[PDB]
Design a protein around this nucleic acid. Structure first.
Lengths: 262, 143, 206
RNA sequence: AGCGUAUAUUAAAGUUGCUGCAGUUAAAAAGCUCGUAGUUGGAUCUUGGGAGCGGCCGUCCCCUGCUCGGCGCCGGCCCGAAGCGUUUACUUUGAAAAAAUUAGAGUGUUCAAAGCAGGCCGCCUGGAUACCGCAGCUAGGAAUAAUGGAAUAGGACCGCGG
RNA sequence: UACCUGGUUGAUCCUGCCAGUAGCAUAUGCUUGUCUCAAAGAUUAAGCCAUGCAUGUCUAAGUACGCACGGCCGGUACAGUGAAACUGCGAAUGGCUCAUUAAAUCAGUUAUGGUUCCUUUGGUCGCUCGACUUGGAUAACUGUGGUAAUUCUAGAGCUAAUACAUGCCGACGGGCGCUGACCCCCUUCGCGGGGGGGAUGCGUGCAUUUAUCAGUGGUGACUCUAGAUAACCUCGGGCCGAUCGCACGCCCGGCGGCGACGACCCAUUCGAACGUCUGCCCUAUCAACUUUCGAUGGUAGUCGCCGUGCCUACCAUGGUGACCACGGGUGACGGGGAAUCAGGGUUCGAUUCCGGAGAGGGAGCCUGAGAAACGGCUACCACAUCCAAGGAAGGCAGCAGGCGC
C-alpha cells in the first residue's frame, strides 16, 4: 500500500451483507460517508440484494440517477453510499419508507415504517464540545455536528432529530432502566432494559442489559444505543422485537408453522 | 543542588518573576487511584518525565517487576518473571523480560529487590516507555 | 536522503538489525536552517499533507516579552552571547530555540516612561532638552495625576535589569523554533534566571 | 476408466517414548565425591451451625464493616447506589474476537461433489449454531501450590498533651 | 477400524533394524467412451526478452470565432452537435512474484492525552470598523523550419479561463478595551474626598508565533477545551467567492428561489504512521557481546507530520547473557490454513483472503493529500536495441508469446 485502497474483495466483505461466493471476485467498497465501511449497508446492496427491485449494478445506477431514493430526507446519487443504523430510506414514486435497524441476528432487516415515522431519527451523541465563542457542540453516531443543543445532553444519551431542520426535539438520558438496542459484538440486535453500568477507569466500561424473558447479557458501553425511556421504544421495531430465542426454539417455531401449513 | 546542567532548570508552566511589594510548584494526580506522593508536592527537584511534576500522561498498561539495577541516571532496570506454557509437554518454562524504566527523584529511596508498579507513557528514550508510579518495600526490610 | 529511522542502529542488546526495506519518504530529514542575524530572509519548505514550514535563514527583528508586567514589543536582535548546547553556535552566531541574545531596550524604556511617568536608564545629569520626554513625564490634570502617583508606587525595578537598560541592551531567551516558524520570539531574562545566566556568561568569558 | 514406477513426507514407529521406550549380560551409568544456576521439596491455621420440602435418606437458601433516597416503618431499622478491602497461579462465567476452510442446522443442484438458495396458491421464507490455543480484559469459587504480617516490640486498638 | 506380516537359527525365545502395508503430491509409463466441477513456468534461472495489448476521462452546468457538420429573418454577442488543445481529476488502486527479512515480518491485545489525511457526510463561511466585472501571457489554429532517427520540437502572427495574477464596495451605526482634553454634581468655610459624564488618538475577527492572568464544558488523568490582557503576521505571503447552469419572477428605471464549482478551520469516513504486552525453525566445531567515528542513560538544541540518540554538543558508565545473549544456517516471507491421524503428535503452508517486501543491482529525487513510484524522472554497475557515427532509446516477478534452464 502506497495510498488509500479502493477495491474490496467479495470474501473480505462484511458477513451481514450475506453476499454469495460464485457471483464475482469483488463487492461494492462503500464510498466514505457518515457510518463506517464495516457497519454500513451500501445502497446497491439494499436495493438489488434485499428489496430485489434491480438485478444488476447497472440497473441500480439507472434507478439512483433518476433522483428516486432519498436517504435521511436528501437525494443520494451514489450507488455505494453507506446507509447505516437508524437511517431513514424514503422512495417517493413507490410510496415506501424503510428504517435500517438490526434483525435479532447480526444483520440489517428491511423494516417498513409509516410516512409520519419516516420524518425523524434517533442519533447517539458521541462527544459534546465547545466551539470558538463558548458555543456548545454535539457530534452524533452518523457524523452530524449539532451546535446550540439542550444544556443537559451528555456523551452517552440519545437525541431525536428532525430530517428537514436537523434540530433536537426530545432526548433520552443514558440511565439504569432505559431500553437499549445493542449495535455491535455477539449480542448484535438484542433489545433489553439497562440493568447496570460497571466503571473501569482506563478500560472499556461493560453495561449489563436485561431482555424481556429474563435473559441477562453484558456488552461494552460503545456498542449500546438507548432507543427508549422505560419499556417504550421511541421507534417501531421489526417482528421478533429483539429477543434472539435459542436454535432449539427457532426450530420448534419453524416446523410448527411448516406442519400447520402441511 | 539543582541547576547542575548548563541550561536553567525550571518547571516551565509556573512563572517565578511576579513583581511584589516561596516558589510555587505544579503537580497533578495521574488518575487510576495513585496517591501523588509527598515528595512531588514538597520537593525542589526538576523533572520533564516525572508523572506527577512533569509532562507525561499515563495511559495503556499497568505492569509490575522487581528492581534489579539502579546504576543509570534517573532510570532503573526492573525484571518481569512469568511462566510460558509449552503445549506438547503439559508443563511450563520459567522466562523473564527486564526493561529500562524511568525512576523520578520523587521516590527518594528504592532498594534493589523492591516491588514496583509501572504505567505505560509515550517513548521517553531509545528503550524507556514506562514510569515508576508506586514502590512496595520488599518482604520486611524494616531493619 | 537524510534518514530519520530506528532500524539503521543497533538493538538494546548490541545486536545488528538487517534492514527489511529501503528508505521510505515519511522517514524524511532536511539540512539544518542555521539562522544567522541579518536582513530578513525566509525560504518556504512544503511538507507532508501539503502544509508549509518557514526556514528563517537571516533575522533582525523579534517579538520579545518583559514578563513581570506583560510588556511585549517587537525589538531588533543585535547579537548572541551564550548557548547551552554548543559554543560554535555562539562563534557562527546561529539563532536556535533557548539561546541567550541581546535586544534593543528602547521600546521597553519608552513604554516604562509613558506608563509610570518616571525615567529609566537616562544617567544622572541627563539633558532631556527635546522636552516632549518632559511632556510624557509632566503636565496632567488633577485626578489623572492621582492615578499616575498611585501607580509609580510599585515601579521598583530590579538593579540587574536597571543596569542593562542604562547600558542600552537587554538579555532575552528565544522561546520559538526560528528555523521552523521563521520567528525569533522570546522573553527578557529576570530574577534567578538572569543571575544564573550572567554568572554563566562571565565564567565562560574569563 | 484406470493402474504401474521414481522421489519428498505422514500413520505403521511404544524405532524419539509428555501420554509412552530402554541403560547387569543385546547399543547404553561420568572412576569418585564437592558444588552455583536449573528441577523438586514433610506435617500444621474453619471444623461446625439456622431453617425449607418430598420417601433414618435426598437436594433447595441463611457465615467484614465504615456517604446520597422510599417498600416504608419512627435523629432510627431496612434495601440501594459512588468507594474501600495481602498479592499470585488454578478453576468456572462474561466480554472482545475478519471472511473462506473445518464441524455443523435447513433445502430432492435428477443423485452426489458442490451451491445459498428456495417454497405456496402476489404471498411465505432462509442465509443459523458451534470451534478460534497462548497473552491481555472482566466477574464468581477458595481445595491445591507459592507469598506477607508482632520477637531490639519502632505491635493492633482506645483514649488524653499536643 | 486403537491392526500388523516376511528375513539372523539345526531348531527356540529376544533385542534390533531391513523389506512389505495404506494415504499424500511433484514427475513419469501404458491405457483413455459419456457428464459435472477444476490446479496449471512455484522449486532450477527474482535468468534474458522480439512483437501486440494491459490507464484513462465531459455533464444543463470551467475555456470552442476548427464551416469539421449545421437550424433562419439574424446584423442586439454566443442556436445546436462536436474533433483538437488548455484546465480539473485519476495514474499511490488493481495485477505479478517470494529474492530479501529470524522479536524483523506477522498474529492476538491495547495506545496517539505523541501525529498527518484527497474524497465523503455535517458544521462554519454580512462575526473583521479599515466593482453593472480589473490585468498581460499561452495552447489548439494559421504559417516558416531543422536532423537519418523518437510520443524531439525552435521561430512569426491571433485568441480564451474556475489556467496565471490583481483587487473593491458592502453589512457599517456602532461595540468593546486602553488614552483622556475637559465638564457638572454632593461633602470638608477651604484644601483634600466620593462617584459620575466624556473630546482627540490607538487597538480590534478566526487561523499563526510568543509571554502573562483567571478557573463554560469534559476526562481515570491536560501543560484539554473555551475565556481575559500585551505584541506578532514569513513579500517563497492563511481565510474574509472578480465562478457556471437551469427556472424566471415579485412594483415605480424597483425586485429574489433551486443547483454546479471553490475555499482557511472543525468534526466524521477511508486510512496511514510510530509505539505497548506475549508469541518463531536448526545450531556451543557460536560463551561472552556492544562503546570514545552511538553502545545504555541525563540536559539543551537540530531535524521530522509528530514521541524518541533520529542526529548534533557537553556530561554519566552503562545495556544484554546459561531463563542461550552475540554469531552462523535455512531448499525461511508471516498468518488464516493443508496432509495425516485412536488420544498425544509429526510434516507442509511459493500458491487466489489478510499483512509485508520488490520491480535487472544499489542510490537520489520531482509532482501530489498519499510515491523514495519504476506501464515517473536522474546517475553509476551488469546487459542490451537503433544508428548518415554526431546521437536516440531501454526495463514482462502485467496478459499472451520466444530462447535458456
Amino acid at each position: 500500500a502506497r495510498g488509500p485502497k479502493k477495491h474490496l474483495k467479495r470474501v473480505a466483505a462484511p458477513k451481514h451483507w450475506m453476499l454469495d461466493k460464485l457471483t464475482g471476485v469483488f463487492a461494492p467498497r462503500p464510498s466514505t460517508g457518515p457510518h463506517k465501511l464495516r457497519e454500513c449497508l451500501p445502497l446497491i446492496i439494499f436495493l438489488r440484494n434485499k428489496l430485489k427491485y434491480a438485478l444488476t449494478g447497472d440497473e441500480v445506477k439507472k434507478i439512483c440517477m433518476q433522483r428516486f431514493i432519498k436517504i435521511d430526507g436528501k437525494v443520494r446519487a451514489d450507488i455505494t453510499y453507506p446507509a447505516g443504523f437508524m437511517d431513514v430510506i424514503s422512495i417517493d414514486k413507490t410510496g415506501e419508507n424503510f428504517r435500517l435497524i438490526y434483525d435479532t441476528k447480526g444483520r440489517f432487516a428491511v423494516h417498513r415504517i409509516t410516512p409520519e415515522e419516516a420524518k425523524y431519527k434517533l442519533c447517539k451523541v458521541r462527544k459534546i464540545f465547545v466551539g470558538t465563542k463558548g458555543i456548545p457542540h454535539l457530534v452524533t453516531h452518523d457524523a452530524r455536528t449539532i451546535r446550540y443543543p439542550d444544556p443537559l445532553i451528555k456523551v452517552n444519551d440519545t437525541i431525536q432529530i428532525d430530517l428537514e431542520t436537523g434540530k433536537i426535539t426530545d432526548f433520552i438520558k443514558f440511565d439504569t432502566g432505559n431500553l437499549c438496542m445493542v449495535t455491535g459484538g455477539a449480542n448484535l440486535g438484542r433489545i433489553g432494559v439497562i440493568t447496570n453500568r460497571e466503571r473501569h477507569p482506563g478500560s472499556f466500561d461493560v453495561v449489563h442489559v436485561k431482555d424481556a424473558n429474563g435473559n441477562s447479557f453484558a456488552t461494552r458501553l460503545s456498542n449500546i444505543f438507548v432507543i427508549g425511556k422505560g419499556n417504550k421504544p421511541w421507534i417501531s421495531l421489526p417482528r421478533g422485537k429483539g429477543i434472539r430465542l435459542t436454535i432449539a426454539e427457532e426450530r420448534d417455531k419453524r416446523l410448527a408453522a411448516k406442519q400447520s401449513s402441511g | 543542588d539543582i541547576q547542575t546542567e548548563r541550561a536553567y532548570q525550571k518547571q516551565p508552566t509556573i512563572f517565578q518573576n511576579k513583581k511584589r511589594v516561596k516558589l510555587p510548584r505544579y503537580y497533578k494526580n495521574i488518575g487510576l487511584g495513585f496517591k501523588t506522593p509527598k515528595e512531588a508536592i514538597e520537593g525542589t527537584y526538576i523533572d520533564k518525565k516525572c508523572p506527577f511534576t512533569g509532562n507525561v500522561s499515563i495511559r495503556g498498561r499497568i505492569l509490575s517487576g522487581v528492581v534489579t539495577k539502579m546504576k543509570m541516571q534517573r532510570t532503573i532496570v526492573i525484571r518481569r518473571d512469568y511462566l510460558h506454557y509449552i503445549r506438547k509437554y503439559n508443563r511450563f518454562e520459567k522466562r523473564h523480560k527486564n526493561m529500562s524504566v524511568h525512576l523520578s527523584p520523587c521516590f527518594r529511596d528504592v532498594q534493589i529487590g523492591d516491588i514496583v508498579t509501572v504505567g505505560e507513557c509515550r517513548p521517553l528514550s531509545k528503550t524507556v516507555r514506562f514510569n515508576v508510579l508506586k514502590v512496595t518495600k520488599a518482604a520486611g526490610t524494616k531493619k | 536522503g537524510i534518514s530519520r529511522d530506528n532500524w539503521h542502529k543497533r538493538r538494546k542488546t548490541g545486536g545488528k538489525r538487517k534492514p527489511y526495506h529501503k528508505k521510505r519518504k515519511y522517514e524524511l530529514g532536511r539540512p539544518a536552517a542555521n539562522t544567522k542575524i541579518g536582513p530578513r530572509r525566509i525560504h518556504t519548505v512544503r511538507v507532508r499533507g501539503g502544509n508549509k514550514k518557514y526556514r528563517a535563514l537571516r533575522l533582525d527583528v523579534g517579538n520579545f516579552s518583559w514578563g513581570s508586567e506583560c510588556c511585549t514589543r517587537k525589538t531588533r536582535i543585535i547579537d548572541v552571547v551564550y548557548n547551552a548546547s554548543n559554543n560554535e553556535l555562539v562563534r557562527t552566531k546561529t539563532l536556535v530555540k533557548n539561546c541567550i541574545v541581546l535586544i534593543d531596550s528602547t521600546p521597553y524604556r519608552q513604554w516604562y516612561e509613558s506608563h509610570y511617568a518616571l525615567p529609566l536608564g537616562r544617567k544622572k545629569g541627563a539633558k532631556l532638552t527635546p522636552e516632549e520626554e518632559e511632556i510624557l513625564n509632566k503636565k496632567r490634570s488633577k485626578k489623572i495625576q492621582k492615578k499616575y502617583d498611585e501607580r509609580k508606587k510599585n515601579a521598583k525595578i530590579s538593579s540587574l535589569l536597571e543596569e542593562q537598560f542604562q547600558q542600552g541592551k537587554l538579555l532575552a531567551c528565544i522561546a520559538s523554533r526560528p528555523g521552523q516558524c521563521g520567528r525569533a520570539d522570546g522573553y527578557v531574562l529576570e530574577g534567578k534566571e538572569l543571575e544564573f545566566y550572567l554568572r554563566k556568561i562571565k565564567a565562560r568569558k574569563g
